[PDB]
Design an enzyme around this catalytic site. Structure first.
Site, PDB file in Angstrom:
ATOM      1  N   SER A  28       0.675  -0.764   0.082  1.00 49.16           N
ATOM      2  CA  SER A  28      -0.115  -0.106  -0.055  1.00 49.16           C
ATOM      3  C   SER A  28       0.688   1.339  -0.116  1.00 49.16           C
ATOM      4  O   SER A  28       1.588   1.608   0.906  1.00 49.16           O
ATOM      5  CB  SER A  28      -1.154  -0.010   1.214  1.00 49.16           C
ATOM      6  N   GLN A  56       1.395  -0.663  -4.760  1.00 49.71           N
ATOM      7  CA  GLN A  56       0.437   0.514  -5.178  1.00 49.71           C
ATOM      8  C   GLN A  56       0.825   1.507  -4.770  1.00 49.71           C
ATOM      9  O   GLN A  56       1.091   2.239  -3.779  1.00 49.71           O
ATOM     10  CB  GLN A  56      -1.234   0.074  -4.152  1.00 49.71           C
ATOM     11  N   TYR A  66      -1.011   5.856  -5.165  1.00 52.50           N
ATOM     12  CA  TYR A  66      -2.237   6.317  -5.679  1.00 52.50           C
ATOM     13  C   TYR A  66      -1.345   8.201  -6.125  1.00 52.50           C
ATOM     14  O   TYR A  66      -0.222   8.197  -5.807  1.00 52.50           O
ATOM     15  CB  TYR A  66      -2.913   6.981  -4.174  1.00 52.50           C
ATOM     16  N   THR A 118      -4.495   3.152  -8.039  1.00 53.72           N
ATOM     17  CA  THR A 118      -5.303   3.126  -7.944  1.00 53.72           C
ATOM     18  C   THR A 118      -6.038   3.657  -8.682  1.00 53.72           C
ATOM     19  O   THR A 118      -6.069   4.859  -8.474  1.00 53.72           O
ATOM     20  CB  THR A 118      -5.580   2.810  -6.329  1.00 53.72           C
ATOM     21  N   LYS A 129      -5.419  -0.258 -11.603  1.00 54.23           N
ATOM     22  CA  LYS A 129      -6.476  -0.954  -9.902  1.00 54.23           C
ATOM     23  C   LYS A 129      -7.987  -0.310 -10.140  1.00 54.23           C
ATOM     24  O   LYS A 129      -8.166   0.932  -9.039  1.00 54.23           O
ATOM     25  CB  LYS A 129      -5.280  -1.047  -9.219  1.00 54.23           C
ATOM     26  N   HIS A 164     -12.352  -2.436  -4.563  1.00 50.47           N
ATOM     27  CA  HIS A 164     -12.046  -1.783  -3.474  1.00 50.47           C
ATOM     28  C   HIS A 164     -12.684  -2.569  -2.703  1.00 50.47           C
ATOM     29  O   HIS A 164     -12.292  -1.683  -1.037  1.00 50.47           O
ATOM     30  CB  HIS A 164     -12.665  -0.345  -3.889  1.00 50.47           C
ATOM     31  N   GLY A 166     -12.065  -9.124  -4.597  1.00 48.97           N
ATOM     32  CA  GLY A 166     -12.571  -9.274  -3.983  1.00 48.97           C
ATOM     33  C   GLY A 166     -13.288 -10.222  -3.526  1.00 48.97           C
ATOM     34  O   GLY A 166     -14.094 -10.782  -4.287  1.00 48.97           O
TER      35      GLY A 166
END
Ligand SMILES: Cc1cc2nc3c(=O)[nH]c(=O)nc-3n(C[C@H](O)[C@H](O)[C@H](O)COP(=O)(O)O)c2cc1C
Ligand SMILES: CN(C[C@@H]1CCOC1)c1ncncc1Cl
Length: 344
Positions: free
Chosen positions: A105, A127, A129, A155, A218, A242, A274
């Protein structure tokens, strides 16, 4: 004690403070998609072949050209040190043991360098942002490159944070001794201040120019958007809602997976997350065209139980359930997991 992923969640509920358990468990709003991510798997039925010789099952595969031991990888879940003192360092060590990959993350409670140091041999991805601060964003990408991460998962479904009602009720915040180490609901407020709601395909063009690492989009849920990602030179699609935490009332990811696999025409790998809790979920996703799946919450429950050992246990359970499901379905290896194994 704990012999399936549901048992690990029940254990976690018994040991975690309510606010932390709720942060991890919750979906957005009425949690319709959260329930459906699981229920949808059950609607897809399996049509096993008999008498195929399954003495020699091989779960190995490849994600973006890198070999992994199984098509089951760790997805990005923020702030893992809330579940166990070793957080992301426990997770990466487990991934290295298992031979699978960890998606780190951007909101981890451990740093890009700390994680590469704890898991040098582990397959690791970042990942990302898009922060309103593009310099911060670039520094994350550059650190990932320098530290031997192998892909960027950008993302794209979080211009703002989803409304998770328990977080608002519990006024969610990090416990006092923790920090996001790479820099109402406290997290929604953070996102609004930190994360860029203006991003568009122009910013994907920027990111594609910024790094030569493979980039996976993503949070795509439409075939048109998947085809736009392929047009922009991206290298994979992670079909994701998500963990049902963003827009509630979107479909289950296993239900939209076939449209996305069709849309991309084999040009890039398609992944799913998910609701993956069982080996048969993995088998269904692969039958419908996914290369691999990612797990979010089950990893956090493994940390809550026993840090690195609890993450290893959860991954080993999924591995053995998947082995068994492949064997009972007549599949010797992942290459023979075909579309006729499933029907809705
Ligand atoms: C507690 C929690 C934290 C999460 N943090 C992040 C994050 O930091 N970045 C991100 O892109 N996705 C985040 N996700 C979404 C996960 O990457 C993943 O899409 C989702 O957990 C998959 O569903 P599953 O929990 O049913 O396995 C988070 C999910 C959860 C449950
Ligand atoms: C020995 N095992 C595990 C099975 C699962 C139930 O009892 C033993 C396997 N070994 C090779 N290929 C597939 C399998 Cl499922």
């Amino acid at each position: 004690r704990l012999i399936c992923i549901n048992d690990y969640e029940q254990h976690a509920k018994s040991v975690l403070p309510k606010s932390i358990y709720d942060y991890y468990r919750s979906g957005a709003n009425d949690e319709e998609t959260l329930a459906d991510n699981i229920a949808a798997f059950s609607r897809w039925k399996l049509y096993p072949r008999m008498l195929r010789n399954v003495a020699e099952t091989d779960l190995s595969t490849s994600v973006l050209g890198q070999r992994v031991s199984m098509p089951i990888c760790v997805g990005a879940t923020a702030m893992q040190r809330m579940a166990h003192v070793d957080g992301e360092l426990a997770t990466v060590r487990a991934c290295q043991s298992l031979g699978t990959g960890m998606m780190l993350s951007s909101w981890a409670t451990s740093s890009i360098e700390e994680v590469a140091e704890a898991g040098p041999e582990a397959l690791r991805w970042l990942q990302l942002y898009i922060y309103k601060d593009r310099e911060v964003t670039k520094k994350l990408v550059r650190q990932a490159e320098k530290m031997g991460y192998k892909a960027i998962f950008v993302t794209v479904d979080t211009p703002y944070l989803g409304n998770r009602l328990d977080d608002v009720r519990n006024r969610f915040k990090l416990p006092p001794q923790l920090r996001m180490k790479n820099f109402d609901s406290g997290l929604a407020a953070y996102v609004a201040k930190a994360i860029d709601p203006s991003i568009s395909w122009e910013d994907i063009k920027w990111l594609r120019r910024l790094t030569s690492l493979p980039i996976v989009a993503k949070g795509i849920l439409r075939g048109d958007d998947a085809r736009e990602a392929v047009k922009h030179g991206l290298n994979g699609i992670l079909v994701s809602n998500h963990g049902a935490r963003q827009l509630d009332g979107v479909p289950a990811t296993i239900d939209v997976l076939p449209e996305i696999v069709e849309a991309v025409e084999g040009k890039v790998e398609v992944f799913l997350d998910g609701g993956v809790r069982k080996g048969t979920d993995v088998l269904k996703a692969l039958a419908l065209g996914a290369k691999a799946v990612f797990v979010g919450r089950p990893i956090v429950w493994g940390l809550a139980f026993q840090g690195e050992k609890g993450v290893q246990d959860v991954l080993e359970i999924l591995k053995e359930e998947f082995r068994l499901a492949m064997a009972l379905s007549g599949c010797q290896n992942v290459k023979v997991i075909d579309k006729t194994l499933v029907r809705k």
